[PDB]
Amino acid sequence: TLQYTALGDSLTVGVGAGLFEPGFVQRYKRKMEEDLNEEVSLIVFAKSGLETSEILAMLNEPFIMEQVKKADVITITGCGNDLLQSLEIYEKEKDEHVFLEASSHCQKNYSGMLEKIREIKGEKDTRYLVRLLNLYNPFPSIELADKWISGFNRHLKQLESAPQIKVIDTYAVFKGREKEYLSIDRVHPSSRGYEAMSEKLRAAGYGRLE
Amino acid sequence: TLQYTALGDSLTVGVGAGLFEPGFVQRYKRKMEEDLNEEVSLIVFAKSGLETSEILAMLNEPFIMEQVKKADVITITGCGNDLLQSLEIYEKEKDEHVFLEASSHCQKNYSGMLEKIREIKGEKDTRYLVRLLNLYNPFPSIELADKWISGFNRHLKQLESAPQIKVIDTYAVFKGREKEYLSIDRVHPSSRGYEAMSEKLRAAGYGRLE
Amino acid sequence: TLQYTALGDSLTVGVGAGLFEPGFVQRYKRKMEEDLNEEVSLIVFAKSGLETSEILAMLNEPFIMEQVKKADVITITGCGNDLLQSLEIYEKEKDEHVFLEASSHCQKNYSGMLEKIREIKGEKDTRYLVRLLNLYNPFPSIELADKWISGFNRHLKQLESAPQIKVIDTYAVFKGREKEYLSIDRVHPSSRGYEAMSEKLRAAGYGRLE
Amino acid sequence: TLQYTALGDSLTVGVGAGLFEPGFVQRYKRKMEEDLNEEVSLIVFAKSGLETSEILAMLNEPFIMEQVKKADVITITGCGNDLLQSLEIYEKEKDEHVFLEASSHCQKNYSGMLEKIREIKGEKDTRYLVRLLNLYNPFPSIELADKWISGFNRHLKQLESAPQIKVIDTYAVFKGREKEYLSIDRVHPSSRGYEAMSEKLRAAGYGRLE
Ligand SMILES: [Cl-]
Ligand SMILES: [Cl-]
Numbered sequence: 001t002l003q004y005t006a007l008g009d010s011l012t013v014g015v016g017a018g019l020f021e022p023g024f025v026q027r028y029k030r031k032m033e034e035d036l037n038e039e040v041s042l043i044v045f046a047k048s049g050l051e052t053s054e055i056l057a058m059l060n061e062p063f064i065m066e067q068v069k070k071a072d073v074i075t076i077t078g079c080g081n082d083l084l085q086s087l088e089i090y091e092k093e094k095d096e097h098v099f100l101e102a103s104s105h106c107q108k109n110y111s112g113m114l115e116k117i118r119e120i121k122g123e124k125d126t127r128y129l130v131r132l133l134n135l136y137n138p139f140p141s142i143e144l145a146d147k148w149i150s151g152f153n154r155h156l157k158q159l160e161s162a163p164q165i166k167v168i169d170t171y172a173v174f175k176g177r178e179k180e181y182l183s184i185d186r187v188h189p190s191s192r193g194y195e196a197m198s199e200k201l202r203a204a205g206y207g208r209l210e
Numbered sequence: 211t212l213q214y215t216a217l218g219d220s221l222t223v224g225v226g227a228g229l230f231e232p233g234f235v236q237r238y239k240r241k242m243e244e245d246l247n248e249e250v251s252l253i254v255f256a257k258s259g260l261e262t263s264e265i266l267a268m269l270n271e272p273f274i275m276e277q278v279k280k281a282d283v284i285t286i287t288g289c290g291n292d293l294l295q296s297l298e299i300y301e302k303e304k305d306e307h308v309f310l311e312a313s314s315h316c317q318k319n320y321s322g323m324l325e326k327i328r329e330i331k332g333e334k335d336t337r338y339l340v341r342l343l344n345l346y347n348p349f350p351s352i353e354l355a356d357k358w359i360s361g362f363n364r365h366l367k368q369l370e371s372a373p374q375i376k377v378i379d380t381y382a383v384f385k386g387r388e389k390e391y392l393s394i395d396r397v398h399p400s401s402r403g404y405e406a407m408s409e410k411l412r413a414a415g416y417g418r419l420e
Numbered sequence: 421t422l423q424y425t426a427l428g429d430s431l432t433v434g435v436g437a438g439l440f441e442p443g444f445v446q447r448y449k450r451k452m453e454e455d456l457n458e459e460v461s462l463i464v465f466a467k468s469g470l471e472t473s474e475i476l477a478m479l480n481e482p483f484i485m486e487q488v489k490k491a492d493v494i495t496i497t498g499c500g501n502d503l504l505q506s507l508e509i510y511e512k513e514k515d516e517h518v519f520l521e522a523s524s525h526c527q528k529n530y531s532g533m534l535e536k537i538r539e540i541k542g543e544k545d546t547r548y549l550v551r552l553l554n555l556y557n558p559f560p561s562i563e564l565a566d567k568w569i570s571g572f573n574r575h576l577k578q579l580e581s582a583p584q585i586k587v588i589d590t591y592a593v594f595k596g597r598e599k600e601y602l603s604i605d606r607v608h609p610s611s612r613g614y615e616a617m618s619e620k621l622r623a624a625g626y627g628r629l630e
Numbered sequence: 631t632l633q634y635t636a637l638g639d640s641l642t643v644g645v646g647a648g649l650f651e652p653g654f655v656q657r658y659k660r661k662m663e664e665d666l667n668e669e670v671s672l673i674v675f676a677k678s679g680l681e682t683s684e685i686l687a688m689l690n691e692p693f694i695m696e697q698v699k700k701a702d703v704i705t706i707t708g709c710g711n712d713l714l715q716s717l718e719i720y721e722k723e724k725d726e727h728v729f730l731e732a733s734s735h736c737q738k739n740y741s742g743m744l745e746k747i748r749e750i751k752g753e754k755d756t757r758y759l760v761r762l763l764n765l766y767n768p769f770p771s772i773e774l775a776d777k778w779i780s781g782f783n784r785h786l787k788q789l790e791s792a793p794q795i796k797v798i799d800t801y802a803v804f805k806g807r808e809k810e811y812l813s814i815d816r817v818h819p820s821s822r823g824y825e826a827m828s829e830k831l832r833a834a835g836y837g838r839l840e
């Protein structure tokens with residue numbers, strides 16, 4: 001029996017697809033049982049607007065680190081709402097320089113996240129799997145958003161240690177397919193976009209699990 | 211690998227124990243694994259304020275019907291918020307019938323969702339298990355609250371068909387220990403209360419599954 | 421010194437205006453000190469996607485009901501995210517009949533809310549103020565959303581007991597002014613829309629506070 | 631009516647005490663009212679993962695500068711998440727300098743935001759009050775964590791100019807009682823810890839305001 005532990009923000013919750021409609025987490029689970037030919041047990045820890053610094057603190061909670069210790073695959077979303085609130089400050093004040101440090105403060109919390117996972121798993125374990133999803137651009141017309149999200153994904157890929165730690169290219173999934181993959185709120189993906197996300201996670205492979 | 215689906219309101223969510231702290235559904239999942247020596251996959255469809263009629267309407271959702279059909283164990287919570295609404299309506303109108311009519315709707319929806327669960331599974335799989343929890347009285351000093359909830363619970367026990375279908379006596383778990391088993395809002399359970407609820411579920415046995 | 425206690429969901433938080441940019445709560449506070457010519461102390465209890473059933477439970481928390489007992493003005497937002505998730509289920513399944521009971525289950529939680537406020541305030545108090553904001557339509561093109569939101573506001577106005585309890589016509593504030601008052605997410609209001617909201621709350625008057 | 635503004639990270643938010651449960655800033659507000667016999671208006675600008683450089687950049691925001699200029703009491707928290715990031719970086723690289731460089735940036739930003747607060751108010755109003763809290767050691771069994779935080783605290787005490795500016799010894803409050811003063815995540819305080827923090831602030835006095 002495989003163990004999938006999913007963490008993140010409004011994307012891991014499934015916001016945009018509707019209440020109880022399967023998001024990317026549930027669909028990536030289905031593609032796991034089909035590929036690896038084994039039943040997988042899922043558990044989710046997510047909240048809209050959940051910060052990355054909070055996740056690094058959560059991993060000390062006994063019930064959470066228990067799920068991480070036995071987790072065969074781990075997915076992490078985050079920082080999507082940090083750039084949104086930053087753009088909204090730019091939308092009101094028209095200043096390109098805002099106190100956002102999404103690239104600076106989120107990326108450093110990510111590397112500390114991965115290290116805490118390593119401590120819980122134990123250095124002897126080489127079998128587990130971690131998959132970080134970068135950010136898509138929901139506002140292609142706004143050039144400043146495309147500059148911020150591209151800069152965050154450029155610095156996020158540096159944390160990849162294939163094939164255990166892989167950064168999923170969520171940006172390329174949504175590039176040129178915004179209106180088809182986004183919900184009516186246009187900031188969270190549709191049920192179609194969550195399906196394409198799960199396919200990109202499947203494209204990353206499963207390392208030594210096979 | 212066993213599949214355990216859980217439906218209901220804030221209790222199935224785990225409100226009161228703290229964010230990401232395990233509620234009763236995952237403490238019951240761990241004990242289920244311990245008592246049957248088999249890993250368990252958990253799926254949860256729950257939201258605060260989800261009344262019993264909505265929970266019945268969920269069973270026609272294609273994705274929810276998928277997880278209910280595969281479920282070896284099903285837990286259902288509900289009608290707790292109707293008591294809070296009725297106590298506030300009684301405070302203004304002093305009509306003792308307002309809750310009996312609302313309690314009559316819950317008992318009808320419980321019987322409705324029960325009839326749909328067997329319509330979903332059919333006659334081949336009678337090995338399924340349903341454990342629905344009755345209502346506890348969070349206000350023991352209010353006799354009308356105790357009388358109202360006691361009447362709903364004796365009418366709810368009519369639905370029991372042991373060992374396949376069992377009605378969990380949540381009222382007996384909480385009676386006398388509302389100070390330590392309820393959370394800060396005096397209506398939702400604490401981690402102690404959720405732990406005691408999961409103990410009552412494990413005590414009910416597992417029927418044909420063991 | 422006046423006391424303003426604000427409750428609600430993502431609107432009371434100020435989502436859409438940016439991080440720390442003043443939403444309608446902060447701007448309605450400013451217009452209170454200008455009109456009533458007295459300093460007002462503000463305290464907020466809000467969370468994105470916060471259910472109305474949770475608010476009715478929150479009012480039993482000792483720290484919350486203390487702020488309500490001394491509150492001169494009280495604002496309540498809610499249920500805006502319940503219709504959003506319902507439309508999103510309709511967007512995927514194309515069924516007009518969904519398990520949403522926003523009009524049915526949210527409105528009944530509202531009347532129980534107002535009664536609990538009355539119990540905390542005491543029946544002798546006639547001076548306090550409560551202001552409920554109805555829902556605006558962020559999707560004017562979608563006709564089903566305009567039908568649902570209009571039906572919710574029609575049943576919500578029935579709870580008005582002027583001038584203590586007033587239902588703010590948030591719908592008319594945004595009607596014909598969507599792109600100007602909405603944030604880039606198009607589901608939460610811009611800093612302009614939060615300003616117009618505060619002006620509508622000011623239009624409701626202040627009852628006996630004057 | 632006194633105006634009390636509060637800036638910082640998750641501590642100023644109140645993370646760990648439970649949702650909507652009072653953190654240290656509102657327990658300190660109640661004691662401030664009790665010790666000075668005057669109502670207090672509270673404004674809070676805080677978010678999880680808000681590092682010290684961002685808090686300094688906030689002081690140029692027009693709305694934040696408004697509340698800081700009117701503030702009779704200002705509390706600042708920060709640099710707590712840098713310790714968590716540094717401990718994870720040290721776990722991989724074993725460089726003892728990684729935190730001293732990060733601790734040097736916090737002490738610089740604290741001095742920076744202090745210099746801006748007087749630039750915001752000027753020379754007319756020297757009756758303002760600033761209480762900044764140092765870091766506690768949530769991991770007492772790690773000597774490197776205790777040594778790192780002790781060094782940051784003695785360098786932080788250089789900024790004290792009593793009674794106007796005071797550095798609150800949060801370390802002494804938590805030392806020896808990390809089991810009961812920390813929350814479930816072993817890093818954020820509990821309601822007991824937040825209560826003890828507010829007691830330490832009231833013990834510091836109020837300078838020229840009393
Ligand atoms: Cl298997
Ligand atoms: Cl509920």
Ligand SMILES: [Cl-]
Binds near residue numbers: 421458459631
């Ligand atoms: Cl005054």
Ligand SMILES: [Cl-]
Binds near residue numbers: 678710711
């Ligand atoms: Cl933080």
